[PDB]
């Protein structure tokens, strides 16, 4: 036991030394020679009403028009952002939903929560009514996040400190991702969908290969649990959000932190993190009832999206980058432009 | 300006809004209360009693009494970092806490079961999400406490205890110790009841506590109290 523990410590030290040896410069020094962005002003365009409880999750559609929001009143509403009209209303069998997902093709949606079951609903049945197509069971903890890889398979996160890849047709998980010491809170899929990153309560972010089902890289540096994670549009980097009121950027190829986004006057945690279409701006939600826009390349605040009367729980940028929608616990979802 | 299909979609959206409003109106009249404790603490017994009078995850129980609807949630099986989902019950009307009165002289793999129960009660009561939420405390195993106290002194659990060994004194001391854990006494109140094989009075006590809590909340809303 002692020999293997010392070998593990030596390997950690070797990894740290190799990571340090490649830190010849920093992102801030390189980006000091480019013009900064101006004051970003966004005006709310639509105020989607109808939810009578806290908003916990939302996801933008591939068409950049339809979006689905999740609330703990037992209802999933598909909104027409262009006209505000409600498309569908799905009464959940469980009112404790904590996450929701929208299929890239739009034929199915998924959600989960304290029930430890991920339910997939078919939105294009011949009968015209939305019905549950498959229920994914096997997790021993609450579902934290879920994202559709395609119409046939889905990847989900659970509070049992493991992530699993599920086959909707078969109904049984094909791969299990173990290694996290704490509950997994968020998931993010790379543009190519070949690999994904997950954040857990252990203040560490792990890189998982979908096909091989093994951990590729591990990232650390946060002083508290990580709540949000999102891939950079290029796919070679990702950002994370933690309760320590700080956002950190990591690079897959450099395997180390690039830049840190934090302010002295921000003391509350971070709920959601998202990237702009070009990656120039980083949007993150905070428990202080507003969302702050951060300059990715300079760590300089770009703007604040105020107007929510409660905690901002989730946010997302449209696939086309036209607008960004923000959810909050006040039962109201707003679209900014 | 809207087309015929646009008008039809607007009408469908209005119908969906009406349905959502009806569902919200139905839900707003239902009492939601959370249950906490340990498996041996009597949660199963309480749930079975309530259900009779009227797999991993959280168990939801529905029962009605005196034309009042109650929704009880059990989260015992959900062993995890509770602070990540305890906030989901911020709107809970009341919290039910079950503790076995006879586990004062038992040990757990805190070492003592009773000490762990008091620690959990202190953690839940002082939680930032339940500052204004009342707690109902149930003592489930007084019948076996009668046998245990007459043979095993209570000093094993509370060394500071120096009162009489009678059952009444021990029960009063336990109740006082459990009640003193409240640091927000001004903002919230704890209702203490003793449960046994007798099942008639538990539902009535729960209904009375719920009604009193709702009355206090309404008085807060109007400005009084």
């Amino acid at each position, epitope marked *: 036991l002692d020999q293997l523990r010392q070998e593990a410590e030596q390997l950690k030290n070797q990894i740290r030394d190799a990571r340090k040896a490649c830190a010849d410069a920093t992102l801030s020094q390189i980006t000091n020679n480019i013009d900064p962005v101006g004051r970003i002003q966004m005006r709310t365009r639509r105020t989607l009403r109808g939810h009578l409880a806290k908003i916990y999750a939302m996801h933008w559609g591939t068409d950049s028009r339809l979006l689905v929001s999740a609330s703990q009143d037992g209802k999933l509403i598909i909104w027409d952002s262009y006209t505000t009209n409600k*498309v569908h209303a799905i009464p959940l069998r469980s009112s404790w939903v904590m996450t929701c997902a929208y299929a890239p093709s739009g034929n199915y949606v998924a959600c989960g929560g304290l029930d430890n079951i991920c339910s997939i609903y078919n939105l294009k049945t011949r009968e015209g009514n939305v019905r549950v197509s498959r229920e994914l069971a096997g997790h021993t903890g609450y579902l934290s996040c879920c994202r559709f890889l395609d119409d046939n398979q889905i990847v989900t996160s659970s509070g049992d400190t493991t992530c699993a890849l599920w086959d909707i047709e078969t109904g049984q998980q094909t791969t299990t991702f173990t290694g996290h010491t704490g509950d997994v809170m968020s998931l993010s899929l790379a543009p190519d969908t070949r690999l994904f990153v997950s954040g857990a309560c252990d203040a560490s972010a792990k890189l998982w290969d979908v096909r091989e089902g093994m951990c590729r890289q591990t990232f650390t540096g946060h002083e508290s649990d990580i709540n949000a994670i999102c891939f950079f549009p290029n796919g070679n980097a990702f950002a994370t959000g933690s309760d320590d009121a700080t956002c950190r950027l990591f690079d897959l190829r450099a395997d180390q932190e690039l830049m840190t986004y934090s302010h002295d006057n921000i003391i509350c945690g971070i709920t959601s993190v998202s990237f702009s279409k070009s990656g120039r701006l980083l949007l993150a939600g905070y428990d202080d009832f507003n969302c702050n826009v951060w300059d990715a390349l300079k760590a300089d605040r770009a703007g604040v999206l105020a107007g929510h009367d409660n905690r901002v729980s989730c946010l997302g940028v449209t696939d086309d980058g036209m607008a960004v929608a923000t959810g909050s616990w006040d039962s109201f979802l707003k679209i900014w432009n | 300006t809207l*087309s*015929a299909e646009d008008k039809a979609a607007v*009408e469908r959206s209005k119908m969906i809004d009406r349905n959502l409003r009806e569902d919200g109106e139905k839900a707003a009249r239902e009492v939601k209360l959370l249950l906490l404790g340990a498996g041996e603490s009597g949660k199963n017994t309480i749930v079975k009693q309530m259900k009779i009078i009227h797999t991993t995850g959280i168990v939801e129980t529905h029962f009605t009494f005196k034309d009042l609807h109650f929704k009880m949630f059990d989260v015992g099986a959900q062993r995890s970092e509770r602070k990540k989902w305890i906030h989901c019950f911020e709107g809970v009307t009341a919290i039910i806490f079950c503790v076995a009165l006879s586990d004062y002289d038992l040990v757990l793999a805190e070492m003592n079961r009773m000490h762990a129960s008091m620690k959990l009660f202190d953690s839940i009561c002082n939680n930032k999400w339940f500052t204004d939420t009342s707690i109902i405390l149930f003592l489930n195993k007084k019948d076996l406490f009668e046998e245990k106290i007459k043979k095993s002194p209570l000093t094993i659990c509370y060394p500071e205890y120096a009162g009489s060994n009678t059952y009444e004194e021990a029960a009063a001391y336990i109740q006082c110790q459990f009640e003193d854990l409240n640091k927000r006494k001004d903002t919230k109140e704890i209702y203490t009841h003793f449960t046994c094989s007798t099942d008639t009075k538990n539902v009535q006590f729960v209904f009375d506590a719920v009604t009193d809590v709702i009355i206090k909340n309404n008085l807060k809303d109007c400005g009084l109290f």
Partner: single-chain antibody
Framework: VQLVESGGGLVQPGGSRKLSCSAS????????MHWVRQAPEKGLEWVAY????????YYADTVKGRFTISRDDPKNTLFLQMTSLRSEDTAMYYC??????????????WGQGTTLTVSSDIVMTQATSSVPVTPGESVSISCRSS???????????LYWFLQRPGQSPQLLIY???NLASGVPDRFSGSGSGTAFTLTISRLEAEDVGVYYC?????????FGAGTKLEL
């Protein structure tokens, strides 16, 4: 999903008749309903429509007042009260589903229909009446409208229907090139403003029938004269 119309038979002009249709296999409550008339050797014609919840009702100018249309969601039944009948009312009546939401495909399902025998609007036209053609060869059918169907929202409200011999009309394309569910990719649509064309890559025996172009921009709905393919 099945729709079975009821009622009909010989009725005198001074009499009355009540047509009833039974719906099953789908959420009838959430679906709008339409009645379509097809007199012998004549084309289709719209009668009335009921929105979900019976909140909105429309009638054709030729049937307004005479016909009272009602709905009964609990029994999944639709009724058409014809207080006064005339000679031109002798036609086969079809019941058609309709659901209106973003991405929806209304008029997707048509009932078998019942036969009743009795003892401004946008004009839709099809220049070609009969187009003889052998199997395999591509076929093109054109439809034109007196008013532009391109609404400001950015989509044209045009529908294409095919009625096989002895069968009810079947939806093919909606607004205005999207392929209806279950139809082969063989069917494609195109157009701009007022000129539209329906093309078949390679014709097969199952394509024999009559094609109707319908506009859904403004009520009352109108149907084209109809182009027949024969071999």
């Amino acid at each position: 999903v099945q729709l079975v119309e009821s009622g009909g038979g010989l009725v005198q002009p001074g009499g009355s008749r009540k047509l009833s249709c039974s719906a099953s296999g789908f959420a009838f409550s959430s679906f709008g309903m339409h009645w379509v008339r097809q007199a012998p050797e004549k084309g289709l014609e719209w009668v009335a429509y009921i929105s979900s919840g019976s909140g909105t009702i429309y009638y054709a100018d030729t049937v307004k007042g005479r016909f009272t249309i009602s709905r009964d969601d609990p029994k999944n039944t639709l009724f058409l009260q014809m207080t006064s009948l005339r000679s031109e009312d002798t036609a086969m009546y079809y019941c058609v589903r309709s659901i209106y939401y973003y991405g929806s495909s209304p008029f997707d399902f048509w009932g078998q229909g019942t036969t009743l025998t009795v003892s401004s609007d946008i004009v839709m036209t099809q220049a070609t009446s009969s187009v003889p053609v052998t199997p395999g060869e591509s076929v093109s059918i054109s439809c034109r409208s007196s008013k532009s169907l391109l609404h400001s929202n950015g989509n044209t409200y045009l529908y294409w229907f095919l009625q096989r011999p002895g069968q009810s009309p079947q939806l093919l394309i909606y607004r205005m090139s999207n392929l209806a569910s279950g139809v082969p990719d063989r069917f494609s649509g195109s157009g701009s403003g007022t000129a539209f064309t329906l093309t078949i890559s390679r014709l097969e025996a199952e394509d024999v029938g009559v094609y109707y172009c319908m506009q859904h921009l403004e009520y009352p709905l109108t149907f084209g004269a109809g182009t027949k393919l024969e071999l």
